[PDB]
Design a binder for this molecule. Structure first.
Ligand code: LGJ
Ligand code: NA
Ligand code: NA
Lengths: 52, 234
């Protein structure tokens, strides 16, 4: 299933490489140590509502 | 937008408004980064000289965080024609960078395959804008948003008099009389994925607004990602 099963547990982009899940993020985000979560590099990251 | 809801504080921060010499909004845009705006190519025919307004939610009240940006470069897709409405995409480079703040933030650009397999397969997206609130009406003074179901490609082609190309997609309702309208053109169609909003479409056209059996037609952003990426290097 990989990326077809809950986006491979990725926060954002999911890719299949050598029958394994590879996560990546959009610009302005860094891939977390768990290789799944996407961490904003500074304020106003893309795609976040400014509700606070 | 016909029907839908007002964009509340900080809800639609990627919305940009194209304003003519008379300071009146005529088209929408999507904020991609501090220097770039994504819009519809056909919007560039609506006015001779135009500026970009960001952080605006209400055109009657001069807000805080609201800013006017002049266009340095207009990057229009050379394949656009009014006979087909195909390739209805443009990128604008601003003279000065946008200051991100409450109500001012860019939408994410997805990667092609993931956008097609994951974003485009979600039940809905969100369209927003300052366009007409009824097929026969004036431009809205308030920024509105509307959750729109993704429409099956076959139903989309069957619904239309005009040719729906591979650079276009349908979204909307068959019965519910809520949709985008004139003046919403060039504005964002975003899809939420785990609390992150990715730009998936550009409001392109429709046969009237909110008409039963008809849908909003959007430029498919995935089809132009490399062209968008390229445009941002210049
Ligand atoms: C040869 S061609 O005919 O140029 C052609 C040839 C080939 C393909 C398409 C076309 C084509 C172009 C434009 C239109 N017409 C429009 O775009 C239009 C009129 C009005 C007006 F009624 F307010 F005036 N509004 N809009 C508008 C604007 C924006 C969003 C929505 C929208 N989104 N969702 C929804 O339901 N409507 C509605 C058309 F029908 C067909
Ligand atoms: Na305002
Ligand atoms: Na409809």
């Amino acid at each position: 299933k990989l990326c077809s099963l809950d986006n491979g547990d990725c926060d954002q982009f999911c890719h299949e490489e050598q029958n394994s899940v590879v996560c990546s993020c959009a610009r302005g985000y860094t891939l977390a140590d768990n290789g799944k979560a996407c961490i904003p590099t500074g304020p106003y990251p893309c795609g976040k509502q400014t509700l606070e | 937008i016909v029907g839908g809801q007002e964009c509340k504080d900080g809800e639609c921060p990627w919305q940009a408004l194209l304003i003519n010499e008379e300071n009146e909004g005529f088209c929408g845009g999507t904020i991609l980064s501090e220097f770039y705006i994504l819009t519809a190519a056909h919007c560039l025919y609506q006015a001779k000289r135009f500026k970009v307004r960001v952080g605006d939610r209400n055109t009657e009240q001069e807000e805080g965080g609201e800013a006017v940006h002049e266009v340095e470069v207009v990057i229009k897709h050379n394949r656009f024609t009014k006979e087909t409405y195909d390739f209805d995409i443009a990128v604008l480079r601003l003279k000065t960078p946008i200051t991100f703040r409450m109500n001012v933030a860019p939408a994410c650009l997805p990667e092609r395959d993931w956008a097609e397999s994951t974003l485009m397969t979600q039940k809905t997206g969100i369209v927003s804008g300052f366009g007409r609130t009824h097929e026969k009406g004036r431009q809205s003074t308030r920024l509105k948003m509307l959750e729109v179901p993704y429409v099956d490609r076959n139903s989309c082609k069957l619904s239309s008099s005009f040719i729906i190309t591979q650079n276009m997609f349908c979204a909307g309702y068959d019965t519910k009389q809520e949709d985008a309208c004139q003046g919403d053109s060039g504005g964002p169609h975003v899809t939420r994925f785990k609390d992150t909003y990715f730009v998936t479409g550009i409001v392109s056209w429709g046969e009237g607004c909110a008409r039963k059996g008809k849908y909003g037609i959007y430029t498919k952003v995935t089809a132009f990602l490399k062209w968008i990426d390229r445009s941002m290097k210049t």
